[PDB]
From Swiss-Prot, chains A, B:
Cofactor(s) required, per the database record: FAD
Binding site for FAD: 8-11, 37-38, 43-45, 49-51, 163-164, 182, 283, 312-313, 315-317
Annotated segments matching region Active site lid that may open upon substrate/product migration in and out of the active site and close to increase the hydrophobicity of the active site, to make the hydride transfer reaction more efficient: 216-228
pH note: Optimum pH is around 9-10.
EC number assigned by the record: 1.4.3.3
InterPro entries in the cross-refs: D-amino_acid_oxidase_CS, DAO, FAD-dep_OxRdtase
Lineage: Eukaryota, Metazoa, Chordata, Craniata, Vertebrata
Gene for this chain: DAO
Protein name: D-amino-acid oxidase
Quaternary structure, from the entry: Homodimer. Interacts with BSN (via coiled region); the interaction is direct and inhibits DAO enzyme activity.
Tissue expression pattern: Expressed in the liver and in the kidney, including in epithelial cells. Not expressed in the lung.
One cellular component term from this protein's GO annotations in UniProt: cytoplasm
More details: Variation of pH perturbs the enantioselectivity of the enzyme towards some amino acids.
Length: 340, 340
């Protein structure tokens, strides 16, 4: 079987791994190749704050809730083991701050020990009068991608640096099944007017004393268009922009001041922090995650394509649920071919 | 008035500043000198793990409960301000794990968001079936000491490296009021059978990925004779020895092994951690905190002596409530001798 994954971000590699584990023993040659024009440090995943937290609003597709759940559990199960940190995994507690009372998120029972903030805790955040506290996990994009790559590589997965112009060429290449995990750039392979970029900029700072994550929410400006501080494995992410439709790939000084200025007010001690880097990435926004099979004929070429992209700003959070769903779909592909 | 404070640890310096802040505006010449033979990096306070957490056991002297409270509130008020991290302060959340069910601590309502761990949270710690989770504060001893010193220095307080062989010499030295904050060595200046050292050894390792504190409790071996992981500002403290009656100042190999092994079992990721330093210190173990006024005549001298020592393993945790008490006792002196 020749499977070609197009994409080397969290979604692409998780899907590749999940498949190899799942069918390597039943399928004779399970040729798995990864095609991508951007690898590790250059993918959107590397710009991710690295926190597990779905949107505060219910998913359009309920199945996405299950996928989020499955991902937390999968990751939680790696906590009590060495190498957990090596794969970019670590527990972290934090605050979700609001200027007004809001309803509980559907994911309240998924995270560890969720509760509302007491007035004495809210005294530490004088600009907010409502909030939640909870424990969750940090899944550092880059570290995780390096890990996956290590696991994929030793699994016999070959990686190829190349921009696919069309599924057709991959199909002509001999790919029996193509897993499309191209993120925000999916519309290029196939027009998808529902897929649009959610430009986000972040500042990575060196402020080790910061132990808890702090996410402020502005219901007026929309999700993530508010300052947040997310401590990672060894640097803190300062952020605050979510601009849908914007394709500007360059760091905007406009945003730099909003983020920095917004974060230092939240955390005055940030004044002593040292800036390590400024990044911009496009969250693959879509009303629903596109995860489905699609047949392509080409006359005696009938290639199978399984899509899995458009995970907006919850790609690290839902990654395993989607990967498992793709493996399940890949299973049907084999059953159609009587491959078991 | 000439006040001589003996001791440069958290207790000494805290008392010095509190007295100075309070009376420097009303006392005519307020001469405050701090005598000490061991300064900052070499005091027990620098070896301290840096967590604010009283004993799980009820307080002997009911008043210590209140001092612990006063201190937490004093520290908490620095949270929302810059320099909080410069004085060694930073919020931290963590677990207190038990092998058996235990009543809540008297301080359950002093810390932020106290609650018991859930079975699913306990699945992260297979060796224990009970525990609490709560948010407390980190007060890096060394940093706090440097901070206090700077404040005291710009306040006009003078520091002298000297070993006070007795109170008398100091009294004869022209000391109207002597604040005795000699910690575990107070027995030398005045025999105290109730004061015994609770030697403790710790290992400071570099493991930035650890954001939460984990403290294990084994009732059979007594307080702090069980593995604990306390993340500091920019290093983690591993520990677990509370040896009363032990006067050994050098690092024990067996103790190194008790800490390292036990901590790696609790937290497996500790394997990638680079050991930064190994230290031993003596908690001033005493059934009660000695904090009282004592009159030493010496024939015509009649020097006031206020003791403030025997804070066991909660010196950082109680420091402020005590300094405020000393400052109160000091006020009385002023009124008696009619200086105010
Ligand atoms: C500021 C910011 C913060 C965020 N923080 C979080 C967070 O803390 N939590 C969370 O869950 N989510 C977060 N995200 C969301 C985000 O990380 C996404 O969900 C993203 O990681 C989804 O992964 P992906 O594999 O779909 O995309 P990507 O990482 O972008 O990978 C896409 C891959 O496809 C390849 N590719 C594309 N087109 C082609 C082509 N034509 N030919 C060959 N190769 C191609 C690319 O090279 C790349 O390898 C954040 C995003 C941003 C930008
Ligand atoms: C491993 C360990 C972990 C601990 N962790 C915590 C923790 O996380 N939380 C917490 O609340 N506390 C902790 N402690 C408790 C501990 O730090 C004490 O409570 C301590 O700081 C009390 O402070 P002190 O000022 O009395 O003594 P010290 O800080 O030791 O200072 C005593 C001072 O007296 C001086 N002195 C003594 N005799 C003379 C003399 N005759 N002449 C001149 N000067 C003299 C000494 O030189 C020194 O300057 C821990 C202790 C240890 C060892
Ligand atoms: N997905 C996230 C989770 C937490 C904080 C920020 C983000 C973000 O989209 O930038
Ligand atoms: N007082 C403490 C608080 C937390 C961890 C250790 C200690 C200790 O005394 O060693």
């Amino acid at each position: 079987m020749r499977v070609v994954v197009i994409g080397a971000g969290v979604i692409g590699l998780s899907t590749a791994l999940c498949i190899h584990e799942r069918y390597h023993s039943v399928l004779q040659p399970l040729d798995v190749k990864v095609y991508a024009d951007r690898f590790t440090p250059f993918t959107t995943t590397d710009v991710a704050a690295g926190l597990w937290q779905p949107y505060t609003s219910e998913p359009s597709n309920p199945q996405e809730a299950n996928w989020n759940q499955q991902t937390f559990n999968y990751l939680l199960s790696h906590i009590g083991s060495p190498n957990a940190a090596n794969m970019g995994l670590t527990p972290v507690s934090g605050y979700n701050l609001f200027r007004e009372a809001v309803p509980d998120p559907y994911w309240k029972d998924m995270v560890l020990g969720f509760r509302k903030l007491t007035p004495r805790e809210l005294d530490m955040f004088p600009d907010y009068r409502y909030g939640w506290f909870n424990t969750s996990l940090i899944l550092e994009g880059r570290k995780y991608l390096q890990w996956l790559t290590e696991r994929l590589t030793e699994r016999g997965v070959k990686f190829f640096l190349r921009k696919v112009e069309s599924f057709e060429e991959v199909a002509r290449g001999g790919a029996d099944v193509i897993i499309n995990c191209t993120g925000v750039w999916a519309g290029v392979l196939q027009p998808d007017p529902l897929l649009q970029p959610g430009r986000g900029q972040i500042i990575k700072v060196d402020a080790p004393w910061l132990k808890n994550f702090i996410i402020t929410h502005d219901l007026e400006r929309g999700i993530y268009n508010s300052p947040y501080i997310i401590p990672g494995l060894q640097a803190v992410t300062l952020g605050g922009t979510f601009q849908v439709g914007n394709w500007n790939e360059i760091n905007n000084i406009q945003d730099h001041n909003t983020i920095w200025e917004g974060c230092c007010r939240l955390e005055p001690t940030l004044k002593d922090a040292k800036i390590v880097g400024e990044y911009t990435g496009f969250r693959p926004v879509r009303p629903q995650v596109r995860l489905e099979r699609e047949q392509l004929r080409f006359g005696s070429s009938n290639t199978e394509v399984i899509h899995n992209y458009g995970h907006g700003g919850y790609g690290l959070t839902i990654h395993w649920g989607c990967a498992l769903e793709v493996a399940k779909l890949f299973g049907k592909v084999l059953e159609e071919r009587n491959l078991l």
